[PDB]
Amino acid sequence: KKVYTTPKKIRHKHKKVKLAVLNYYKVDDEGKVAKLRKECPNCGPGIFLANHGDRFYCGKCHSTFATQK
Amino acid sequence: AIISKKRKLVADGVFYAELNEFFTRELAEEGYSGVEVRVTPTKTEIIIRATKVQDVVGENGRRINELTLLIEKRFKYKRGTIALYAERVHDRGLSAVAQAESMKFKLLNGLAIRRAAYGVVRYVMESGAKGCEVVISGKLRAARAKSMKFADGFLIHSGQPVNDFIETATRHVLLRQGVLGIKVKIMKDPSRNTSGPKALPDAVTIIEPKEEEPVLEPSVKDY
RNA sequence: GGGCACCACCAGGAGUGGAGCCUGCGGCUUAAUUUGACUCAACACGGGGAAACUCACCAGGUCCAGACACAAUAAGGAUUGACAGAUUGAGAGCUCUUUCUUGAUUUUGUGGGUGGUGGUGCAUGGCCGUUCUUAGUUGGUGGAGUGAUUUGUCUGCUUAAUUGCGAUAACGAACGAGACCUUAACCUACUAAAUAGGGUUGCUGGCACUUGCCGGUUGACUCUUCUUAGAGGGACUAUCGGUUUCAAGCCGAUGGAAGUUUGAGGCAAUAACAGGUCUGUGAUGCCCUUAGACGUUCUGGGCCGCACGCGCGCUACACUGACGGAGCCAGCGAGUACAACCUUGGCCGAGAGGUCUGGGUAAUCUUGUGAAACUCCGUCGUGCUGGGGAUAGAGCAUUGUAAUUAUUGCUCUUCAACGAGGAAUUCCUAGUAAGCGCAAGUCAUCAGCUUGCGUUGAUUACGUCCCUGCCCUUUGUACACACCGC
RNA sequence: CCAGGAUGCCUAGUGGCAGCCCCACAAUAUCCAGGAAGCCCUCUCUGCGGCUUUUCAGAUUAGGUAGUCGAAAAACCUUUACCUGCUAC
Numbered sequence: 047k048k049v050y051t052t053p054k055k056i057r058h059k060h061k062k063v064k065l066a067v068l069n070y071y072k073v074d075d076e077g078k079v080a081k082l083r084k085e086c087p088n089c090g091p092g093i094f095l096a097n098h099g100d101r102f103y104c105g106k107c108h109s110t111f112a113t114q115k
Numbered sequence: 116a117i118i119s120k121k122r123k124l125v126a127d128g129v130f131y132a133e134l135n136e137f138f139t140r141e142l143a144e145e146g147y148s149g150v151e152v153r154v155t156p157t158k159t160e161i162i163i164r165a166t167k168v169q170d171v172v173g174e175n176g177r178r179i180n181e182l183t184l185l186i187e188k189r190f191k192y193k194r195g196t197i198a199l200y201a202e203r204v205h206d207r208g209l210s211a212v213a214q215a216e217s218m219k220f221k222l223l224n225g226l227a228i229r230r231a232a233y234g235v236v237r238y239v240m241e242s243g244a245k246g247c248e249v250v251i252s253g254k255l256r257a258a259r260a261k262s263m264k265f266a267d268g269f270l271i272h273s274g275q276p277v278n279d280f281i282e283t284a285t286r287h288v289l290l291r292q293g294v295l296g297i298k299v300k301i302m303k304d305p306s307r308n309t310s311g312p313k314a315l316p317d318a319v320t321i322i323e324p325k326e327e328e329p330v331l332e333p334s335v336k337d338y
Numbered sequence: 339g340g341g342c343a344c345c346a347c348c349a350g351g352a353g354u355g356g357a358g359c360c361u362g363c364g365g366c367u368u369a370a371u372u373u374g375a376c377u378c379a380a381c382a383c384g385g386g387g388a389a390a391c392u393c394a395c396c397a398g399g400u401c402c403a404g405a406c407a408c409a410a411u412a413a414g415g416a417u418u419g420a421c422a423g424a425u426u427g428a429g430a431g432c433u434c435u436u437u438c439u440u441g442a443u444u445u446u447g448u449g450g451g452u453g454g455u456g457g458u459g460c461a462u463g464g465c466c467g468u469u470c471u472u473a474g475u476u477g478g479u480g481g482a483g484u485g486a487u488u489u490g491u492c493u494g495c496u497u498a499a500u501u502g503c504g505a506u507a508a509c510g511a512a513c514g515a516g517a518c519c520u521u522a523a524c525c526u527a528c529u530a531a532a533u534a535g536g537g538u539u540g541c542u543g544g545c546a547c548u549u550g551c552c553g554g555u556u557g558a559c560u561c562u563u564c565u566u567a568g569a570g571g572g573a574c575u576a577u578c579g580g581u582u583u584c585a586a587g588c589c590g591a592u593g594g595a596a597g598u599u600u601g602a603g604g605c606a607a608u609a610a611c612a613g614g615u616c617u618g619u620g621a622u623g624c625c626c627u628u629a630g631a632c633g634u635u636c637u638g639g640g641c642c643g644c645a646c647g648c649g650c651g652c653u654a655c656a657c658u659g660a661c662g663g664a665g666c667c668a669g670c671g672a673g674u675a676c677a678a679c680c681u682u683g684g685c686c687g688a689g690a691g692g693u694c695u696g697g698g699u700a701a702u703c704u705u706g707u708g709a710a711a712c713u714c715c716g717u718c719g720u721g722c723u724g725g726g727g728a729u730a731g732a733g734c735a736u737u738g739u740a741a742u743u744a745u746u747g748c749u750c751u752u753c754a755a756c757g758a759g760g761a762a763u764u765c766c767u768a769g770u771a772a773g774c775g776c777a778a779g780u781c782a783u784c785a786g787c788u789u790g791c792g793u794u795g796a797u798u799a800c801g802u803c804c805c806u807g808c809c810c811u812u813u814g815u816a817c818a819c820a821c822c823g824c
Numbered sequence: 825c826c827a828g829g830a831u832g833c834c835u836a837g838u839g840g841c842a843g844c845c846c847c848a849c850a851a852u853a854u855c856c857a858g859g860a861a862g863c864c865c866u867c868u869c870u871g872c873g874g875c876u877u878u879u880c881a882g883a884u885u886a887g888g889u890a891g892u893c894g895a896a897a898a899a900c901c902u903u904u905a906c907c908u909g910c911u912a913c
């Protein structure tokens with residue numbers, strides 16, 4: 047057979063940078079809750095917006111926002 | 116449904132072939148030989164010839180039922196329109212496929228091959244073949260391949276007396292060292308063939324003549 | 339010495355080899371122009387006419403399809419997903435920009451599989467090819483040998499044939515050949531038909547105009563010759579003549595549809611070959627490989643490149659023609675409902691091809707596939723000419739996602755080589771050869787290919803061992819891996 | 825690769841529908857047998873296949889030996905030959 051080419055640069059699947067008990071949401075009083083950012087208009091509450099410099103999206107609908115918030 | 120008649124026929128044939136193949140694959144332990152398909156209105160009768168009929172059956176409708184279900188799944192039929200039956204084979208030794216299967220099984224088990232072949236031949240003879248032949252091909256010891264032929268009686272090679280008379284049976288056998296190719300030809304006796312001619316085309320048996328007494332006067336015998 | 343064969347030659351035909359062009363295969367070239375196979379038995383073969391797919395090759399990227407076992411994270415996430423533009427060949431989240439999703443699938447290891455048009459056909463199966471479709475092969479007694487063995491299985495003559503007749507330590511047998519089977523031929527003899535064809539007659543069109551001629555209509559009635567295709571017969575070398583130990587047979591006349599094994603095939607023994615195929619194969623041993631794969635999968639190419647060799651092929655070198663009209667006749671087939679098949683009939687278009695409509699799942703419709711080569715009357719007359727059609731340029735079409743490295747078709751234009759091809763060598767013996775087209779196969783689209791089909795239809799043998807091969811016999815053999823020997 | 829200059833019988837032909845109208849058959853020698861491109865060859869304008877090599881390998885296959893092929897610098901214009909592979913109830 048013919049020899050393999052060998053440029054060098056390999057690309058692996060990203061490990062994702064997992065993070066839980068994320069700093070979204072808050073509570074001040076104790077009794078009631080204070081939501082941070084916002085929930086989805088398309089789907090029901092529980093899902094939360096992605097916040098960037100005048101650009102939003104959500105993951106349950108893979109990524110489908112446009113309007114600011 | 117509703118196609119060119121010839122095309123339909125072809126399709127049916129293909130289906131049958133597939134079924135046969137499946138049976139060969141699956142009913143190895145059971146010692147399957149051949150299928151018989153009767154396509155009437157509503158119901159379709161799938162008859163199965165195997166050695167271990169009981170095994171095929173299971174325990175009053177189980178394995179057979181499963182098979183039926185599988186068939187239905189394959190070919191878009193409904194429950195009721197397929198009917199399987201597992202029947203015995205009238206004389207196993209006259210069958211060729213069955214013999215081949217048996218041989219394969221023996222090989223798998225681990226028996227002296229030549230001896231096994233001889234035994235098979237003997238069995239065939241007992242059953243009542245005019246003659247039979249077994250070829251076992253491959254690496255029967257050593258790396259170099261050999262063919263091993265074991266035969267008894269007559270063996271018609273040429274002509275139409277082959278499709279009519281000789282049942283053939285090929286079957287590969289997988290082992291640790293490699294593959295063994297088993298072929299079996301069983302020349303059924305003409306008298307017990309039923310379908311087609313009951314005798315060879317070249318043989319001309321002449322009946323024995325009957326004696327008479329000449330003269331004994333002119334005479335008469337009136338009523 | 340004796341056989342046999344148009345894969346041998348005679349007697350002839352058609353040729354190929356030359357010409358151009360197709361296509362195989364070398365050689366070179368190229369990232370890569372994937373590979374298998376080289377006397378017959380490699381070279382239009384791999385059903386291999388590659389536009390991607392196919393595909394194995396190259397440049398590049400994607401994906402896990404890493405089964406299962408066992409631990410490291412075990413939700414303070416295992417890993418799954420992810421629009422936006424840069425990114426990217428690129429509306430490949432391929433990612434690095436991102437900060438949202440996903441919930442224990444996984445995943446990180448370690449046993450363990452799995453896939454591979456990776457390797458090895460000189461590790462195998464099966465299938466195929468070839469010795470060989472030649473006439474060869476075997477054993478049971480019995481005889482000859484201590485024996486391996488031998489005879490049978492053979493001087494002769496026959497036959498396509500170890501086919502027979504004969505002669506005979508051989509007798510009777512089996513396989514192979516033959517028989518067999520399928521098809522191709524005959525049936526005014528049967529069984530049959532508005533899915534096959536006719537006859538009378540109704541209505542009905544035209545004629546001559548007497549009653550007669552051609553028609554068109556599934557209007558009626560009836561038939562089975564042609565049709566089909568069921569069951570049977572029929573050919574057995576039959577009758578006669580010679581010829582041959584008056585045998586096997588062969589040769590000639592007669593009749594007969596048939597007298598070449600009636601023609602053509604299908605199958606086709608023993609023993610084999612280091613023949614081919616591990617690129618048909620969830621046929622497979624072992625090796626290799628085995629998560630940036632030699633797995634897969636996308637994307638763009640490539641098998642098609644050209645100083646040049648050979649191999650199948652087509653087109654022509656014209657006057658037995660060319661071109662126009664006109665005449666006008668086959669047989670094998672094949673053909674869709676979950677697809678897009680064959681596609682008449684009507685209109686548009688010089689064409690190709692478009693359109694509307696049908697008919698057909700098919701002796702019904704395409705289809706009488708009114709195929710060509712042919713036949714008739716005219717135009718050019720033996721000039722590289724109107725022979726010949728290559729290379730060329732342009733446009734018009736179609737197939738498909740994609741046509742440049744013209745896919746193919748059509749339209750105009752360009753008009754090259756080649757005045758029957760040297761040494762060589764192929765094929766052939768009758769509905770054959772050669773010509774001619776059709777036909778399916780592959781097929782979205784492409785025929786110069788192929789398996790068949792019919793149409794037109796000859797010349798010359800009907801022998802021989804000169805060559806070539808093969809077969810036997812007798813001989814010789816320091817060979818037995820067997821002359822590529824020793 | 826070449827061509828005829830003239831001493832001459834030529835001969836105003838013989839055949840096939842002679843007729844002019846085409847076909848074929850008939851005219852010794854030739855004297856020269858001569859000219860043009862190519863012509864054994866040697867230096868140049870200084871060519872691409874040798875020289876060794878060192879790196880490897882393609883492989884050549886059933887296995888192996890000896891040679892050969894492929895990518896990198898220096899003067900000169902073959903992939904074959906040969907060794908070795910297998911047995912009874």
Ligand SMILES: [Mg+2]
Nearest residue numbers: 049050051052
């Ligand atoms: Mg690669």
Ligand SMILES: [Mg+2]
Nearest residue numbers: 271272273274
């Ligand atoms: Mg026989």
Ligand SMILES: [Mg+2]
Nearest residue numbers: 273274605606
């Ligand atoms: Mg036969």
Ligand SMILES: [Mg+2]
Nearest residue numbers: 345378379468
């Ligand atoms: Mg041959």
Ligand SMILES: [Mg+2]
Nearest residue numbers: 361362386642
């Ligand atoms: Mg090609």
Ligand SMILES: [Mg+2]
Nearest residue numbers: 382650787788
């Ligand atoms: Mg060919």
Ligand SMILES: [Mg+2]
Nearest residue numbers: 388389745784
């Ligand atoms: Mg193509």
Ligand SMILES: [Mg+2]
Nearest residue numbers: 453454455617
């Ligand atoms: Mg594969």
Ligand SMILES: [Mg+2]
Nearest residue numbers: 454456616622
């Ligand atoms: Mg493999």
Ligand SMILES: [Mg+2]
Nearest residue numbers: 459612613614
């Ligand atoms: Mg082999």
Ligand SMILES: [Mg+2]
Nearest residue numbers: 459460612613
């Ligand atoms: Mg080989």
Ligand SMILES: [Mg+2]
Nearest residue numbers: 479480481488
């Ligand atoms: Mg004896």
Ligand SMILES: [Mg+2]
Nearest residue numbers: 488489490491
């Ligand atoms: Mg002998």
Ligand SMILES: [Mg+2]
Nearest residue numbers: 577578579580
């Ligand atoms: Mg006679």
Ligand SMILES: [Mg+2]
Nearest residue numbers: 599601602603
């Ligand atoms: Mg015949």
Ligand SMILES: [Mg+2]
Nearest residue numbers: 701702705706
């Ligand atoms: Mg028809």
